[model samples]
Target: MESNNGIILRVAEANSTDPGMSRVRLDESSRRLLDAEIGDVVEIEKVRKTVGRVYRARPEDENKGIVRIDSVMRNNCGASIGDKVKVRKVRTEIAKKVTLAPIIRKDQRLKFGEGIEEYVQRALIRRPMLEQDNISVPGLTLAGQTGLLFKVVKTLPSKVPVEIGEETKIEIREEPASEVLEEGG
Candidate 1:
């Protein structure tokens, strides 16, 4: 849905190394359009190529009609400098299943489920997997940010006939008890 009074603003890349969750600094006017309190979730449209990156709205920004975000977020969302983007207050939550694909590089054929079963186990159970495990399901947009961490439930059709690439489809089922109770009760 559009904002209550939708406001489109130009992108302003914030230079910082904070790999924190996706968040935006909105000025007073923009905040009025949002009718938002602090820490409200704002949906950033035009970057829906993957999952929508949820951003927290910061109303303390003094720059009107401009949104401040990290350069990595701009790059990830394919937002160009001065590109006008739509912002609206929204509420989002984690889903029971999350499907993700690894970002492959030049001339690399990524493999899954060969020796990486342990990593998959850790991810599904919400345990911390080691970095050297050499497996990843990238671009998880959750809780007002994008994360590289993910869990695996089981792949479709069967695990044997699988190739870890952009075309691969993996389903992840991990949700809290509150969400589950709300679903079935």
Candidate 2:
């Protein structure tokens, strides 16, 4: 079924970090365009990827990709024996106003008492995953941001997972574009 505004949707920032579930004030144009309220359900798009490193094989070390990452192991698509990269993967989350409040206690209740809302959450989604040589999913754009911190799960799917480092492209699922809400009535 269609929404109240027929579609209740529009394209805004198809690519954003909202990582910390932080809310940067939107301009009047954005507020109007998105039909956002002080508290409305919303979701943002994201591109996740993984991080990895390369090293030189020492006398005791026969492999260059041998790493000590506790998380997933991502391969370097085609990186040589000694290529270094920051480990990573970006994720998405829903955000809500941290300041908004309901008069829970009629005795003494203020809009917001005192606390740390470092940020707000507004959507539903996973933290994201990506191995080395990883890239963001199609459709969503991270530009310079890889999205999140993803550790390599296993190295070199081509050879032995212990071959340690072998860069390779992996698949990632993108958020459905229609899931985003278009505000304003």
Candidate 3:
């Protein structure tokens, strides 16, 4: 049942040009139940809890009891499309520091070099992060356009939702995340 505290909604694929932006769209009534407004942080829970900025659902999705989320968000909370997840308004703080590790695959040749930190920071600004969340951002590589996958290794003032601001210190590591197992392993 939907309530002011939290609402259960089915996940739907987001219709977004840039899926890495980390925002979710909910119906007006659902947003009201969570007492969340656009750009406000909201906690999405399935196997784990993750947070994202809220936006009003599109016309086709109103009254449908669904939340439109990109694959990155779905991965963060361990939920896939058609799965039910709990959504609730959350309080967040500006992050002082955030550590990210690239999700390197055996077949991929990825490089973590100078100027990449600024790029990561730019991609993550204004996005909410919880430790262990997986996110992907589009990046240009010598080979071609590729997705840069990162895992939230840590966050300063931990154990709470934190938004990445322009001044937030971002640490990008060359190593793959140790906390999360490799895909298809």
Candidate 4:
């Protein structure tokens, strides 16, 4: 459903290759319709809007009217598989600062000591985020692979889309998210 406002596509599961990388893959035609180049930020909208970098869909997914995004992106946009979402090309400012907080279960215990800043910065670099968006990052620890969930508490240019670059200052707070809740609950 291509319209003047945006192209509507069904949500599909993310490709295993780029899981949790904050990416969305759409058909080539959809990309053209949005006038977005590969790696450009595009806003996916249902009732809420979330941003993700665009990429060409896999061979089997071409011209299928589907957008592949991970669970994190789905949560950000309040979408589910098979749900139709509108995608539009959007301009974003380079983020000067971003504050994030973990969203852990009430009983869950984790520490944000050293090396977490670098890890988060490395994972989120070049990704666009809006304030109050939720994101998950892979957490590799001595025990095993644990994924950590975080909410964007604040952005320097509040209420606008911002891209995290090398110069962007990332602050991960030790406290749990103020608006915290279990995802998909």
Candidate 5:
């Protein structure tokens, strides 16, 4: 169920290239409709209904209040390209689908905000096998060169004990991309 007051934002099919979190690019007018600014939380509805934080839309964008959601978000929201979606300023909620694990690297725990963790979980679900010892994700570390190695010590809900084991070496590769965004403008 969604709140009564929400702004209507058009959903554009997001490229596979965007980062994990579903992003809504809000312009001045859209921000006013949502009563939000950059970095504020907004509830997103349709398909995989969830809350996402506001991010600035580049001035070059063709329109305002266009939500550029990722494939993950599109899949979750059960939405397709060019679908209209509802958005509103709402408090972030712990995602029911958020499957969490305790993994830290470089002596510092990686911080994920709100829906970010859930996005990462969807990204991981694409792996060959979901194993406890599955301790590697591309660019999981600050070094940016090594696979972020991890050991799963716990699983949520059922509280299953994670069994750690060494697995066959899996090669990490990137496919031909449809689009690539620069690291920084």
Candidate 6:
């Protein structure tokens, strides 16, 4: 199911290589990150985790052996942070006649956005919200997911920010490429 209107989650924080950044984890099992701008609204969904992986790691000290962690991600934003995700059922989607067996299991490709484009006409023109976008998406799957997917489907000349708090949809690809624009040049 989908909604014409979407709900909002005040960015709890944005995690980054630098501190004081708003932290939005990539996924539940991730101390990694999700590309988001603080104070921005995301299209929320209620999907369930489609896959789970076992992670092996060792503690800094003590008698702890290889610790196993789970990597689970659901398309829907329904499950908060904790909860055991279970496999509901499995189905087959792809197959070949001359194969040893059918390839029943597969992974979905997730895409990310290129972040918000700056309006050169605004603020000379750096906006604080623009400062917090995800930087460097060198190898992200460009086909399946998007950080700014809506733009492609939109015919509008411009789409205003969804909310006024801040545009977390910022991007750093243009960071080094950007410089101080002036008032009257």
156-179 per-residue lDDT for model 6 (tens digits): 112211211132222212122123
lDDT of 5: 0.47
lDDT of 4 by residue, 122-181 (tens): 788877877777776454334332334677768897555677888788787867644555
Q: Which ten-residue region of model 6 has the weakest summed lDDT?
A: 96-105
Tell me the number of clashing residue pairs for each predicted model.
1, 30, 0, 0, 4, 18
Ten contiguous residues minimizing lDDT sum, candidate 5: 160-169
Please provide TM-scores, in order, for all candidate models, with all chains considered together: 0.50, 0.19, 0.74, 0.72, 0.46, 0.19
Name the candidate, 2 or 4, with the larger TM-score value. 4
lDDT of each: 0.42, 0.23, 0.70, 0.70, 0.47, 0.21
Which ranges in model 1 have alpha carbons more than 4 Å from their true place? 1-5, 14-21, 47-62, 105-111, 114-185
lDDT tens digits by residue: candidate 5, 22-83: 35666777776646766666667764345456777766255475777665455444567788
lDDT tens digits, residue span 1-185, model 3: 54435778888784555363357777777777647877777778866767777787766346358877777677776776788988778768988888878775443455547877777778888767787777764544444433346777688856467887898888888675436563421
Whose TM-score is greatest here? 3
Regions of candidate 2 where Cα sits further than 4 Å from its true position: 4-20, 46-185
Any runs in candidate 5 off by more than 4 Å, and if so which?
1-4, 14-16, 93-185
Candidate order (lDDT): 3, 4, 5, 1, 2, 6
* Candidate 1 vs 3: which has more TM-score: 3
Off by over 4 Å in 3: 1-4, 14-21, 60-64, 106-110, 113-119, 139-148, 177-185
Cα deviation at 41, candidate 1, in Å, is 1.1
| Colliding pairs, model 4 | none
State the displacement of the C-alpha of residue 134, model 6, in Å, after optimal TM-score superposition: 18
Error of 4 at 153 (Å): 3.2
Please provide, for model 1 over 1-185, each residue's C-alpha lDDT reduced to its tens digit, 9 standing for 90 to 100: 65343467787654455454256666666766657556555555435211122333454455477776655445544567677776665544322222433333232233255434334334434321111111334453434422233323234322111223322323432331222111111
Model 2: per-residue Cα lDDT at residue 107:
29
